[PDB]
Amino acid sequence: MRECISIHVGQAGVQIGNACWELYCLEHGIQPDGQMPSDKTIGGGDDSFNTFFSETGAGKHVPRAVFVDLEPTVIDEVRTGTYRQLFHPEQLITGKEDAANNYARGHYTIGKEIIDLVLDRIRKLADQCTGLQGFLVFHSFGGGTGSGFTSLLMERLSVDYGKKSKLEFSIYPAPQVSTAVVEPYNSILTTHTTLEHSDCAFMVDNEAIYDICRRNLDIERPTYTNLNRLISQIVSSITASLRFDGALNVDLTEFQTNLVPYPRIHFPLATYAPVISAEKAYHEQLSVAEITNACFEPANQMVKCDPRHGKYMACCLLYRGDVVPKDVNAAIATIKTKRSIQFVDWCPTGFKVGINYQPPTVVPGGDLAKVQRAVCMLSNTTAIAEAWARLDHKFDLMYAKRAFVHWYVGEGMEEGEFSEAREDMAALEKDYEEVGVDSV
Amino acid sequence: MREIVHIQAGQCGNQIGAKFWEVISDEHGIDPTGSYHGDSDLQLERINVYYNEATGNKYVPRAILVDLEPGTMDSVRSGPFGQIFRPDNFVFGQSGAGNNWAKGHYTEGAELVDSVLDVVRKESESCDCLQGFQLTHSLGGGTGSGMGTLLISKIREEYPDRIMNTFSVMPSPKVSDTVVEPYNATLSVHQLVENTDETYCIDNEALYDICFRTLKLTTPTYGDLNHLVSATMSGVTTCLRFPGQLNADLRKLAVNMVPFPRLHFFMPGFAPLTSRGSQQYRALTVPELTQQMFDSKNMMAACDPRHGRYLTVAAIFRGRMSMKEVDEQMLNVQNKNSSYFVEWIPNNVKTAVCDIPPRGLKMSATFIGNSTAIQELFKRISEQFTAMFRRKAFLHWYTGEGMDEMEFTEAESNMNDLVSEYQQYQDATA
Amino acid sequence: ASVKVAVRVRPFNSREMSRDSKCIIQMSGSTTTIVNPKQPKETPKSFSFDYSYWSHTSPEDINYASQKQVYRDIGEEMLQHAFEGYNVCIFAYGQTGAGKSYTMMGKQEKDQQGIIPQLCEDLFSRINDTTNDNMSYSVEVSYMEIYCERVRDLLNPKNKGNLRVREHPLLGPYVEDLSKLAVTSYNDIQDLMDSGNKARTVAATNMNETSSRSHAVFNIIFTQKRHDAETNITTEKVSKISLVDLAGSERADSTGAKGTRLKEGANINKSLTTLGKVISALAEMDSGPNKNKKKKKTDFIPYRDSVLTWLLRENLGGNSRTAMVAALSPADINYDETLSTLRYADRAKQIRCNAVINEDPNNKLIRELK
Ligand SMILES: CC(=O)O[C@H]1C(=O)[C@@]2(C)[C@H]([C@H](OC(=O)c3ccccc3)[C@]3(O)C[C@H](OC(=O)[C@H](O)[C@@H](NC(=O)c4ccccc4)c4ccccc4)C(C)=C1C3(C)C)[C@]1(OC(C)=O)CO[C@@H]1C[C@@H]2O
Ligand SMILES: Nc1nc2c(ncn2[C@@H]2O[C@H](COP(=O)(O)OP(=O)(O)OP(=O)(O)O)[C@@H](O)[C@H]2O)c(=O)[nH]1
Ligand SMILES: Nc1ncnc2c1ncn2[C@@H]1O[C@H](COP(=O)(O)OP(=O)(O)NP(=O)(O)O)[C@@H](O)[C@H]1O
Ligand SMILES: Nc1nc2c(ncn2[C@@H]2O[C@H](COP(=O)(O)OP(=O)(O)O)[C@@H](O)[C@H]2O)c(=O)[nH]1
Ligand SMILES: [Mg+2]
Ligand SMILES: [Mg+2]
């Protein structure tokens, strides 16, 4: 059987997990208290889909999750909220203090004494698990606890398990806006972690999702709840193939091998096509061709990165709902006909296609219209490199004068670690530059 | 669980502490008798930060009241919230320092510091995980400056890892209530720069300007100034007591605001301030809060930000609001006033958001600035110090207590070096 | 001034021998090449020091730099150059177990001695050579250590308190009540060094079994007088020679220190960073006015950020000659640390200060009054 374990780190990770588990509980008809009336009504089937929820004797369904944080506030918000009965009481909270936007505190000094408990809980879940597929790690660059503890946790996980897949969903720092001064340092110091240990890292920018909300859904003052709900929709579209039936199903491994031409270039961009409000849901056909075309629009990208400035190394489409392969083939042919989408000359195949019968579900109180069709597109392209270059500039502007360095050095980190991380990032940029050159 | 130990010394420190304990007590629904008569559950979620549980189901603030004159202690006890403080934390003597820094630091305070540290050591030992301390004291006086600096030094020796805040009142440019303000100010600033993590600068001239120009009060008293200060202190530590979209402890600010160890002098501010009758006209929104936060006349430090450059600022919002609006407003403030922010710190605006506003308001905001203009204040003090040290105007009162001219020279040199360090980055084009 | 970054490579160590023991440092004359163990195909990092040395193969003589060569290239040259009224600052910047003591002291019993034996014995023999009725000298020494922003005395008996750092308005920073001594001979200096080295705090770590967890300073104040009273003025020279040992940067990943050890390491790294910053700043400042235009508008050097730079304010820059010995290792684990050290060397090696001081006012007052 098929199952995967979700790990959430930091405030961003915990809140995205709240949204994700709301969506999953809505999807499988599980009440907030863990009970499912459907078993009494339907009396059959597999409504307790084991990909996420473990079933106990009394009919309760405990999610396969491990929340982690250093501030008691964020986890305590969950432990006395609507879903207080859903989760196992083991929430793995450090009751000392937050890392304070510091990589060293999250990785060297305070990250210790808590890594052991997290690994013990994850080992218990793995032993309880059969046919484990992989890990889904949620965290955020820039933040101290997310960066440092994700680094430490991934370092331990690569040793303990090794061959199990590890998909990473992360929030990259924005190009213009930001909520911290030391964001570039924390973001740069995670390059080693994201390179060596992670198997595939998905990146999303707050500015892009704000623009999507402003333009598509017509929301004038969106907050983090809408962002988390959209990210939850992305993850649900990714992981749907393991649960509901489909015509062309794509598990995590076959998804992975079709997106990474080389080991070091596992940074795909993600996008969701039918982001539309209830008012504008009418006056729209939302056929397969329309959503497929809208996937490639520059405005709908989830990261502030123009794909027209680079080449598409690979693409993977995951459709949900009333979809037939004929329309998918027609849309793929139409996309290949276009000029503005430039593909590398060494990937003639181009696209991977998957189709699932379960349509997306509408969370009550949400901002997404009920639609019969949807599609999520995950594309490995070169243009992401440009975004990294921007961040690199900021790092230099703060490292020439050694601003804020003493905070990091006073927590056990050495100064040369900054230069090592910068050199690794430059090597990654050079690798992304070399791969995009046309063969001769 | 993160606990803050509060200390207050001198008349000004004790007054501000009394007003501050009245404000926080309301936010967390605490009766003057100590019993809890609130309505919301969240009031008791993090009560432990400032209060200790008593055996009779009443809450005692974790405060240390310090002085060298029983008059202020008697005034505090015979007050609206005098009964809230436990009697064992009233540490005092007699024969106050009397505006003599040497008496506060060397002669008189040395006899009483032991007792004070003992209470502090006790209060600290009970806490589960101490975040840091905070001290309120005016630098212009004797008891405040002397005993505050001595306690800060001793505590930093005892607790190197913890955080040390300070809400100190600097001497004003024009207003001067004492003749020997510059001496005490110089020595206190010499002591503070070495042994503190943060230091919020407050000036009575700025607070009077706020009371007159903004609030339109006709006859302000020290109660209103203490009200403003206490509002700021309650605003600073909001994230350690309520949930929010983005949390921000005291350390997260210290990390984000202090680029180099010696630059930890901050300019505080608060918004809104509607002046009791104009609130019906203005609509309370995030852009209005940002505008009033970044205004020059709203600052409490009596130093124009436009005469320097912002090294880094932090905004702590309280209330229900959207993150997009806050982020775009901070970005617009950066882009419009491009010349007043340094160029080698991209995105130098920290943001924190809490979703439990003050009881009487829909939204509020606290501003903490770190700019190069603050050097002006120190520069001014230095001039006055020189004007009295060339001729040794009142030196015989200090040297009689054991100090010597050498220490004055060290203090002046350190102050000048701090001013030069701040002036290093206030430039253009490099 | 100068810094004369003595890039030195020592023999292998048991921890290194446990790994693939292959040196990654080579040279040709003044050219120093460092191979990347992880990228041997790449062209090795190349630097041009006149003072790069290689003692990993001690018995060799082909392109072998003995300690006498190091002294000739740095020691007597720097001494005589700074002899005309300067302050000389020799300090050891390096890493843990990076052989920072053999540079400083070396084999006392052998003729392959460190910098201090050669310098002190050469100076002492020089003054003895010029000892006469009308030519006399006077030498004083002092020892101190910095644990964690706290100064302690090593020569004086156990004083559990920490000495208070003061600032004389004319003479600059100094240590209150620090024990100072007068010395007549070189063997006395050796004995005092032995006592001070024993007195310091020491702890063991993986990279080195006897790592020093403090920053040690050894000051020498040396005065010279000639008494041809008819046509000469007594006390015609004084010099300040400062010899400092600096605990190396604590690579926490390569040591795994915990508890108090970690705290010490933390402080050490902080101090080192400040020192590096000063050495990066000072250089640029002295490079700007001396070369560019002579403007001298204003330049700020952050001395006060740490006790080490504060106490060495007179010696690190301003009006002092300096010296660094970059104690490298031939290991692959230390390639990044060596690169950092020599990159700060690239931000050093001139410093360019000015001096000429130490007249005798009272002796010339005889001629003035007469
Ligand atoms: C009709 C109406 O709008 O009433 C308001 C009001 O007029 C204004 C002017 C209030 C009023 O404040 C003042 O008049 C004032 C005078 C001198 C110094 C400071 C304030 C108010 O008193 C203050 C009061 O707010 C509070 O009480 C806050 O919760 C405040 N707590 C206290 O002031 C307090 C005092 C004693 C004991 C316990 C609490 C607070 C602020 C920050 C953090 C924690 C608590 C409010 C909304 C009002 C009145 C009543 C008129 C303002 O209060 C603040 C927080 O500054 C002045 O600026 C705001 C803007 C408000 O519009
Ligand atoms: N998209 C999105 N981003 C978020 C959300 N919450 C926080 N973030 C981002 O996460 C970053 C910091 O997150 P955290 O690491 O969790 O911060 P923290 O929990 O206080 O812990 P420290 O970072 O160590 O201080 C911020 O810069 C935000 O931009 C969210 O709900 N949605
Ligand atoms: N050129 C050399 N020839 C022979 N032996 C040497 C040479 N240089 C160093 N050594 C030896 O290598 C060791 C270097 O000393 P070491 O134990 O590393 O002290 P240290 O590293 O300087 N202490 P520290 O660097 O402050 O942590 C000693 O055993 C020396 O005798
Ligand atoms: N804001 C405010 N300032 C005060 C108050 N009382 C005194 N001050 C200021 O404090 C200074 C005198 O310091 P003082 O309290 O006497 O110090 P101490 O004698 O050492 O305790 C004066 O310059 C006043 O402006 C007060 O209640 N509120
Ligand atoms: Mg975090
Ligand atoms: Mg050594």
Author numbering:
A (entry chain A): 1 to 440
B (entry chain B): 1 to 430
C (entry chain K): 4 to 373
Please share text taken word for word from the publication where this structure appeared.
These attributes are crucial for the long-distance transport of cargoes in neurons.
Other classes show single MT-bound heads with a trailing-like head and a missing leading head or with the trailing head of another dimer occupying the leading position. The most distinct conformation, termed T1, was exclusively observed in one-head-bound classes and is characterized by having a docked neck-linker but a nucleotide-binding pocket that is semi-closed. Intriguingly, in the ATP-bound state of KIF1A, we observed a significant proportion of molecules in a one-head-bound conformation with a docked neck-linker. However, our structural data also indicates that binding of the leading head is necessary for a more complete closure of the nucleotide-binding pocket of the trailing head (~50% of the motors in the AMP-PNP one-head-bound configuration where in a semi-closed conformation).
